[PDB]
DNA sequence: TGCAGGCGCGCCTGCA
DNA sequence: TGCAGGCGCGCCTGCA
DNA sequence: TGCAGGCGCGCCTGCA
DNA sequence: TGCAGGCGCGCCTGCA
């Protein structure tokens, strides 16, 4: 009770707000898609089966978020699987990935599924 | 909204969160047995600088441990519910009204963040 | 309900 | 020397 | 010198 | 509907 309500209180800090900011910005984009069911399987059952979650490739590879940029793969791969992950040289997409990063195409896949840790 | 509260339960990042949460109930608990959670409630909601202090007791190093992390108290709770980038002591302030302030070496430490003003 | 295991303050080490 | 961080004994908690 | 980070126009939201 | 304001991708800049 106490507790709860005085957590109710606290001061968000940037990571958190940030994280959200980074969720709602795929979520938009997956809804207008249709592919946010997949997002969903994909985070909840770990299947790496999942199809390919993509998202439009921009001219640097990079995607914005509050001020802030990352390759899209690194940004949800720290996000829902490593979040020590260091940079995109620490990521292999396994061969079922048709839209991996590395593969340069119009879409870029963002299933955290359809990559693997490596330790560059 | 729904799915991205649900896609946000199942991040990777939460070590921050349960913190926050144990460092709460640290203090509650030592508040309950000295009969002053309400004015923490009534400092925290009103954001009323006339409140009473707000201690607990003062270690050696004047460092308080909350699940394996170590802080100034009073740095701890302004941090918690006034300045989330707040760096250090250095960047704090006690108003004079503030009876058990940090830099006084008292047994008793104010944790009421609105004993302190950010510098 | 006895007791294994969690965790904080005090003690100590180790840099800048 | 201000500060960070590791870890044990004493205190406290939650099960089979 | 590669590349992190600043910032503007275009896009979009939100009031009156 | 005239207008304000937030923010990202594309463009550009400044260091270690
Ligand atoms: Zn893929
Ligand atoms: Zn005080």
Redesign the interface.
């Known amino acids: 009770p106490?507790?709860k309500?005085?957590?109710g209180?606290?001061?968000?800090?940037?990571?958190?707000k940030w994280?959200?900011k980074a969720?709602?910005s795929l979520?938009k984009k997956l809804?207008k898609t249709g592919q946010?069911d997949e997002?969903?399987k994909a985070?909840?059952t770990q299947n790496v089966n999942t199809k390919c979650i993509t998202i439009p490739r921009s001219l640097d590879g990079r995607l914005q978020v509050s001020h802030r940029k990352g390759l899209p793969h690194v940004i949800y791969c720290?996000?829902?699987?490593?979040?020590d992950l260091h940079s995109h040289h620490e990521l292999r997409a396994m061969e079922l990935c048709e839209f991996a990063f590395n593969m340069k195409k119009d879409e870029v896949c963002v299933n955290p599924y359809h990559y693997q840790r490596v330790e560059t």
């Not at 720290?78 to 979040?83: A, F, V």
């Open positions: 106490a507790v309500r005085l957590l209180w606290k001061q968000g800090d940037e990571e958190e994280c959200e969720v709602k979520v809804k946010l997002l969903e985070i909840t720290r996000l829902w699987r490593w979040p």
